[PDB]
């Protein structure tokens, strides 16, 4: 139950805004190198596809991301566009860790208007603490790339 | 509501299959034309990835698809790769209806181990009979085609 990864990018469109800051203050706390990718909180109203790209490019093997938007949907279908990416929306622990241990998830998608923000930092806890599974996994997960 | 599309292309991994085969009669029961497009159920293992391209071609504003392994997970993933899809995982009627008003979803992923059949059913229900609301989510969801 060690932490997968250390570098994590975080990005929202204006309804995640509060969330992305409070998850990004957590991570620090954690000893996380913490990237915020926008979109600046004086904004208003923007499109949440517009900032899955800055996060998305630099996501590897030791660098996770975080999508934040309304529901989460929007940005778990934007990440994963690219094949080099593993997003997945989680409202729950349990969600988290079966993404972590079947898809190797390396994008954790967040709906800032469905959860609250003590249960998001607890999904994020587990995403960033959970293990691959590898073994019968790998290969599928070879095949989303 | 009215059901937006009249066509549905299903697929699933060996998890899925009889899922699969109950939303697809009930599909079928509903009027609907639909398309199985595997894997065979005497496949005892197969890998989820190798049965989305058959469904996600198909897809359009007058087709829509559902993919199911495991948990949903996974397929939800295979099926956003290509940019005419927007798939989300529902467990929930609530999550169907969002898909589909902010998103105009046109794929629905479920987790065949942790959703029961009947509550599938109302997913399903909610997803096909959910109209787009266009307005301001017009823009993002041209920009998820780009």
Redesign the interface.
Same mark, same amino acid.
């Given at each position: 139950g060690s932490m997968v990864v250390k570098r994590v990018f975080l990005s929202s469109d204006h309804a995640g805004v509060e969330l992305r800051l409070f998850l990004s203050a957590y991570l620090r706390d954690l000893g996380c190198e913490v990237f915020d990718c926008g979109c600046d909180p004086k904004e208003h &109203?923007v499109?949440?596809?517009?900032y899955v790209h800055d996060v998305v490019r630099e996501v590897s093997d030791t660098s996770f991301g975080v999508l934040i938007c309304?529901?989460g #949907?929007?940005m778990? #279908?934007?990440?994963?566009?690219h094949?080099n990416i593993?997003?997945?929306?989680c409202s729950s622990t349990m969600?988290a860790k079966? &993404?972590r241990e079947?898809?190797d998830?390396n994008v954790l998608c967040f709906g800032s208007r469905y959860i609250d923000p003590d249960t998001a930092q607890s999904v994020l806890y587990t995403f960033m603490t959970t293990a691959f599974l590898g073994g019968?996994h790998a290969?599928?997960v070879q095949?989303?790339g």
């Open positions: &109203s499109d949440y596809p517009d309304g529901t #949907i929007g778990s #279908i934007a990440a994963n566009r094949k593993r997003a997945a929306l969600l079966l &993404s079947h898809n998830a019968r290969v599928r095949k989303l």
